[PDB]
Amino acid sequence: VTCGQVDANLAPCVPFLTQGGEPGAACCSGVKTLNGNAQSPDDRKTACNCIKAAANRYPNLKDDAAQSLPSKCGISLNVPISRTINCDTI
Amino acid sequence: VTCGQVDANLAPCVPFLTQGGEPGAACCSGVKTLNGNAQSPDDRKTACNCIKAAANRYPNLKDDAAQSLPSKCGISLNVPISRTINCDTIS
Ligand SMILES: CCCCCCCCCCCCCC(=O)O
């Protein structure tokens, strides 16, 4: 996994992550793809740092949307979406 | 490249990165390895964020030691080592 595919996977989540509402089919599909590429702990740490960068790309980001995405998509997201996560814990 | 490889390659650089002086042979070897695994720009951004994490792992780290590591090792590191870099800016 690489930061560029992570960016690609989360691009359709930008509306939900910045304006709220519901993530939608494309967002959840991208998140599922990314969760599938983040199976091992190494992959998970790399994806976590990539996601931290993507999350920090937007100051308008809503923490409640980021925190509710995994349950709104019905996925056990191994990598949380936050601007302040320390990816060494993953 | 992956964050675990970044951690492993930079582990022998921790003494220089926290107390200064000169990087050991193993440190410079790890840095050259990392320069070699980061061929594409995607690779470079991934390595940059991994390196940001590793750099933030110790606040006792000296940022100037991090900035001087590649030239002290005599290698042009295509990816900068910083605790506060926004990795979207790099090429
Ligand atoms: C000109 C940019 C190409 C299209 C990407 C849109 C950039 C703004 C983000 C708006 C949300 C788009 C989500 C999506 O990719 O479906």
Side-chain angles (χ1 to χ4, degrees), chain A residues 1-38 40-90, chain B residues 1-61 63-91:
Chain A
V1 74
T2 76
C3 278
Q5 324 157 22
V6 163
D7 296 344
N9 292 174
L10 303 177
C13 299
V14 173
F16 167 69
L17 288 165
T18 55
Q19 311 171 30
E22 304 297 326
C27 172
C28 293
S29 290
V31 172
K32 179 73 209 63
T33 297
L34 153 63
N35 194 74
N37 298 327
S40 66
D42 205 353
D43 291 333
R44 285 176 44 176
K45 283 168 151 262
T46 313
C48 177
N49 291 294
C50 290
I51 284 147
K52 187 160 153 180
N56 274 296
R57 283 201 274 268
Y58 331 115
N60 44 329
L61 165 85
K62 272 82 198 150
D63 276 282
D64 310 328
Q67 289 183 298
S68 69
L69 196 163
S71 81
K72 277 178 174 306
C73 289
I75 300 158
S76 180
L77 198 46
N78 281 306
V79 307
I81 291 139
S82 99
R83 294 188 280 164
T84 79
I85 185 143
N86 160 22
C87 297
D88 288 327
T89 59
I90 314 300
Chain B
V1 75
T2 75
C3 279
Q5 280 149 215
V6 162
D7 295 345
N9 287 327
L10 300 175
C13 299
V14 173
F16 168 70
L17 288 166
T18 56
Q19 310 174 294
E22 300 294 325
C27 171
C28 293
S29 187
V31 172
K32 185 75 210 64
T33 297
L34 282 186
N35 193 75
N37 299 327
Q39 317 141 117
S40 66
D42 204 356
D43 290 334
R44 286 186 291 276
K45 284 169 153 94
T46 312
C48 177
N49 292 294
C50 289
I51 291 266
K52 186 160 153 182
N56 273 296
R57 210 163 283 143
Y58 334 112
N60 40 324
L61 167 141
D63 278 282
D64 309 327
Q67 243 186 297
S68 316
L69 199 168
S71 82
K72 273 179 172 306
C73 285
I75 179 54
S76 180
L77 197 48
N78 56 6
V79 188
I81 292 142
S82 170
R83 295 190 281 128
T84 82
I85 185 141
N86 162 20
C87 293
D88 291 326
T89 60
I90 80 146
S91 325

